Amino acid sequence: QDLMASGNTTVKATFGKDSSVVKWVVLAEVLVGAVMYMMTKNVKFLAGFAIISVFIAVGMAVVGL
């Protein structure tokens, strides 16, 4: 038989690549990384401009329904 835990495709369309999660995680870096030049003012927080698309691909393509 089937299962009762899924069968609605609700969490897949909400927490996925083609949803709204990828938009709320791309603006959080510029909200704090682009304003920390007051006290620090050093080239340090620049290694996060490429790991955003990588972390979302190594976690969503694990199962894939």
Ligand X SMILES: CCOP(=O)(O)OC[C@H](O)CO
Q: List residues near ligand X by CB under 6 A.
A: 42-44
Closest distance between ligand X and the C-beta of residue 44, in Å?
A: 3
Provide the greatest CA pair distance for the chain: 61
Closest distance between ligand X and the C-beta of residue 46, in Å?
A: 7
Q: Which amino acid is at 4?
A: M
- CA pair distance 54, 24, nearest whole angstrom: 16
Closest distance between ligand X and the C-beta of residue 26, in Å?
A: 21
- Identify which of residues 23 and 44 has a Cβ nearer to ligand X in the complex: 44
- CA pair distance 33, 61, nearest whole angstrom: 28
